[PDB]
Amino acid sequence: PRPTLQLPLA
Amino acid sequence: NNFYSVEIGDSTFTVLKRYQNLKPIGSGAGIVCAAYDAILERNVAIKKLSPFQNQTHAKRAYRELVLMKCVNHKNIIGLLNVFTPQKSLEEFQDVYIVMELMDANLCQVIQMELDHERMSYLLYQMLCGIKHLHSAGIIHRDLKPSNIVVKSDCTLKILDFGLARTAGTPYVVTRYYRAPEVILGMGYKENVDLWSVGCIMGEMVCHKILFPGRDYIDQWNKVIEQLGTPCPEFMKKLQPTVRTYVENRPKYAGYSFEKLFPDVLFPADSEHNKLKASQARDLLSKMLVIDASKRISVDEALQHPYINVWYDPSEAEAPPPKIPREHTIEEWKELIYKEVMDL
């Protein structure tokens, strides 16, 4: 299934 | 008038009234602004092709326009609108492309410490974007971190379609990402794109450019020192003139992928998933192969244990884009205009 991921972008 | 002018640095941005609060985001050789679409109630990216000054720019702008409309994929940047302030073919000067707005470049991701899941998922999406273009026989040719855009939810899209074209046989690919078949003037097939993915993947792990050549010829020295002199089977494939120089180079053993990419440089192997440094390194060793006939394909890369965990046929087996080559500047200007008015 479609993942729930995060990138800390400034 | 339906348009209005706003200065961005020094160049003038004459955009539709609907596009408000224009802020510079990126530079090119086309300037890009972030804006708000009052009609669509969403953020947009507006690129001004600074387009038909010469026959080279003309083909680049035509390719960009035609491929942007035909391609419809999750990992390809979508076209929202195309317009021009000018009202006639003779008046015609500037072309504006409106797309979905992403949060950043892959340069920012290269300055980040990722876990295996985010690296893998970003690479999987990149491969999906490339597989989509290749399914229509289109090769990107210029994959680099400034052509790859990302969102805070770790989603990714491919950007530049100026050099994107079918398989063929000068210096337009960015140096560091140039494959041996582009550096050495051989013919390039679809997997030329996988070399670029290997350079980007290596940059993500090392957080520095993989092959930092100081010029176009020194670029070859950087590759053979790390990977080893190619075997004679690859030399026979070179044009006699290029072959003499390549055979005349000092001989390099190269380094193993374990020495090029030690465990310490990869993310730690998580207890919560099955992704591993040894698989990422195996994938790198199959992409960073000098001889393109011994290097893996995009499909084999999507089948790879480091990537296949995310496989979804809706993205990975999406129907190919439906696509419906020498002209003068006058013929090109007319050709660009016809495509701008159509869409």
Ligand SMILES: Nc1ncnc2c1ncn2[C@@H]1O[C@H](COP(=O)(O)OP(=O)(O)NP(=O)(O)O)[C@@H](O)[C@H]1O
């Ligand atoms: N749709 C977009 N969303 C977010 N950022 C974008 C978008 N389009 C462009 N950018 C930003 O603007 C930069 C330059 O865009 P662009 O000129 O299209 O690519 P380029 O091929 O790297 N440029 P160049 O080769 O120097 O002419 C990108 O590297 C991004 O930082």
